[PDB]
Amino acid sequence: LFSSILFSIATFFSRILGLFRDVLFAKYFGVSYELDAYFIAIMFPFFLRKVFGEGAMSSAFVPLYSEKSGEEKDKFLSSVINGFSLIILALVILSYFFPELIINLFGAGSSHETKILAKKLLLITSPSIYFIFLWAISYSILNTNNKFFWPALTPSISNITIIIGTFLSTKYGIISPTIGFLIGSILMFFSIIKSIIKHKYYFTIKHFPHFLKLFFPTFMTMVVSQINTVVDMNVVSFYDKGSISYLQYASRFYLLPYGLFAVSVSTVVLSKISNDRKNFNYHLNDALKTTLFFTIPSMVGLIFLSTPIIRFFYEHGAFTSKDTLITSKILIAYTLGLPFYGIYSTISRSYHAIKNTKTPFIAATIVSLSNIILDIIFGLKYGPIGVALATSIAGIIGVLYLLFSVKTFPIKDFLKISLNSLIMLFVIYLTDFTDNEFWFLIQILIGILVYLIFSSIFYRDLIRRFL
Numbered sequence: 001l002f003s004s005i006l007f008s009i010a011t012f013f014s015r016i017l018g019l020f021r022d023v024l025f026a027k028y029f030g031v032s033y034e035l036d037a038y039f040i041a042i043m044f045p046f047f048l049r050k051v052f053g054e055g056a057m058s059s060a061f062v063p064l065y066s067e068k069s070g071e072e073k074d075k076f077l078s079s080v081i082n083g084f085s086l087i088i089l090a091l092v093i094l095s096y097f098f099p100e101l102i103i104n105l106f107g108a109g110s111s112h113e114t115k116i117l118a119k120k121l122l123l124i125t126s127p128s129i130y131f132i133f134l135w136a137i138s139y140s141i142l143n144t145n146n147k148f149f150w151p152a153l154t155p156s157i158s159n160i161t162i163i164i165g166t167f168l169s170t171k172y173g174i175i176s177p178t179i180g181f182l183i184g185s186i187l188m189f190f191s192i193i194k195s196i197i198k199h200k201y202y203f204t205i206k207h208f209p210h211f212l213k214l215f216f217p218t219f220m221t222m223v224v225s226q227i228n229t230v231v232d233m234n235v236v237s238f239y240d241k242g243s244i245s246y247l248q249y250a251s252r253f254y255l256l257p258y259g260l261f262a263v264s265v266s267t268v269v270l271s272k273i274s275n276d277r278k279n280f281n282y283h284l285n286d287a288l289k290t291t292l293f294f295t296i297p298s299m300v301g302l303i304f305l306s307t308p309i310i311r312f313f314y315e316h317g318a319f320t321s322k323d324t325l326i327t328s329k330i331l332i333a334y335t336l337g338l339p340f341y342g343i344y345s346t347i348s349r350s351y352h353a354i355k356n357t358k359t360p361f362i363a364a365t366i367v368s369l370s371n372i373i374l375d376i377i378f379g380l381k382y383g384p385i386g387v388a389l390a391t392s393i394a395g396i397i398g399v400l401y402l403l404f405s406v407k408t409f410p411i412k413d414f415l416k417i418s419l420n421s422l423i424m425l426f427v428i429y430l431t432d433f434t435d436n437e438f439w440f441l442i443q444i445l446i447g448i449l450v451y452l453i454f455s456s457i458f459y460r461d462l463i464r465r466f467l
């Protein structure tokens, strides 16, 4: 368990480091066409990391690597590296000659000056793909040797190098964090290079067709399942300049309470279902109560305090009062979906825990199609706020489908949690007088205390049994 607590500390600071990276973007670049161009240029390697984070490489590499032995293991590894090196080299050369293909994938609607700059930055980011693939392969090898802690922290390397590049941007401009992104991908790979170079190199691609047969179907499935990322960005690119940047500032901050409250708090309770499948309904209700307990007060507090929170973190240097006003509205639009995505995540993973992949797949399809259609309608009409809202409404639709499916929900506890959250709201509203820029921190503490006090009143009998 000591490694589990250590990994939580490591994850917290890794999340905070990403937040600090964005804080510096706001200070050194604010919201601008030039940061739009940066995000366009990094989005393909970023997107590819996300897909490999869902297991796209390990899903095929692990079984085919582990089944082999002796120098057939080296020959398999060489086949994978050689085959991908060939494909990637071809596509980086094509990227140099036709950068508009990648640009128009993520920023088709962006202005002329944006696309020109993104072309220049893509010359630097496109090679990072090669080092991301190698990183993903080494990551898989480490996983087959039961190494999980340290490989999971290597993305922090890239955030440090981007941060350093952002500091140097006062001399070079936006190209400095772009170079930092490339160097980050190189050093991420070098941090775990030994797992690859301990193998003998073979001039062979013998096993590459075998590996592709198992890799590509799953890889494409994971591409499609993460596509809403691409659609969000491409739709907003048609709005005002800086729209891409607004969406990144708001969504990257929102992912902090999302990851904590909509997913992580309910994991332990959800873990029990696999071992105790015949009590599925009880355990699912238990997990849903936990999710609601955290997401409902968090949603209320975040929305009420969205402007002072954004101001505290982002409103420095080039990030203006106007930027705070807009980013805060986008954050509210996302935060309205927090409890719905919490419920969604809880029911979906509970289904997986009992080997039902069909119902989670249908729900995910509904959410994805809903999100695309609503992006078209609301995103083209209202820019980033419309895209954020579309994402939240899509989650509501997914929740309605899943609730009709499991036909269970802890209604009594939802009402108790909601009342405690509204009592909390009433109190924080009363403490809203000073307008000091740091007062929102005290209101968060007051809100937590009020919420837990009244939680203990309404759950007194339950606390006694636990205590």
Ligand SMILES: CCCCCCCC/C=C\CCCCCCCC(=O)OC[C@@H](O)CO
Residues within 6 Å of the ligand: 077, 078, 081, 085, 086, 088, 089, 092, 127, 130, 134, 196, 197, 199, 200, 201, 202
């Ligand atoms: C070579 C294709 C590059 C595609 C375009 C990106 C440009 C990259 C530039 C330089 C790459 C140098 C890094 C080379 C990294 C080492 C390659 C490797 O993994 O070898 C493993 C074997 O020894 C064991 O199987």
Ligand SMILES: CCCCCCCC/C=C\CCCCCCCC(=O)OC[C@H](O)CO
Residues within 6 Å of the ligand: 087, 088, 091, 092, 095, 126, 129, 212, 213, 214, 216, 217, 219
């Ligand atoms: C600008 C740099 C961009 C670099 C982007 C690198 C992405 C490469 C990913 C996969 C290999 C693609 C080649 C796939 C070849 C076809 C695979 C195949 O044959 O799959 C058969 C399957 O059974 C039928 O469903």
Ligand SMILES: CCCCCCCC/C=C\CCCCCCCC(=O)OC[C@H](O)CO
Residues within 6 Å of the ligand: 434, 436, 438, 439, 441, 442, 444, 445
């Ligand atoms: C996330 C929860 C943990 C965070 C813990 C942070 C600890 C508190 C830090 C700073 C408080 C600063 C509060 C400053 C309040 C302003 C006081 C003031 O000067 O108010 C003037 C006005 O006239 C009144 O009437």
Ligand SMILES: [Ca+2]
Residues within 6 Å of the ligand: 030, 031, 032, 318
């Ligand atoms: Ca600006």
Ligand SMILES: [Ca+2]
Residues within 6 Å of the ligand: 070, 071, 074, 198, 199, 200
């Ligand atoms: Ca060997």
Ligand SMILES: [Ca+2]
Residues within 6 Å of the ligand: 315, 316, 317
């Ligand atoms: Ca300020």
Ligand SMILES: [Cl-]
Residues within 6 Å of the ligand: 031, 032, 033, 034, 241, 242
């Ligand atoms: Cl601008």
Ligand SMILES: [Cl-]
Residues within 6 Å of the ligand: 068, 069, 070, 073
């Ligand atoms: Cl072996």
Ligand SMILES: [Cl-]
Residues within 6 Å of the ligand: 042, 162
């Ligand atoms: Cl970034």
Ligand SMILES: [Cl-]
Residues within 6 Å of the ligand: 064, 076, 207, 210, 211
């Ligand atoms: Cl194979």
Ligand SMILES: [Cl-]
Residues within 6 Å of the ligand: 207, 210
């Ligand atoms: Cl084989």
Ligand code: NA
Residues within 6 Å of the ligand: 029, 030, 031, 032, 318
């Ligand atoms: Na500017």
Ligand code: NA
Residues within 6 Å of the ligand: 109, 237, 238, 239, 240
């Ligand atoms: Na426009």
Ligand SMILES: [Zn+2]
Residues within 6 Å of the ligand: 206, 207, 208, 210, 211
């Ligand atoms: Zn093979």
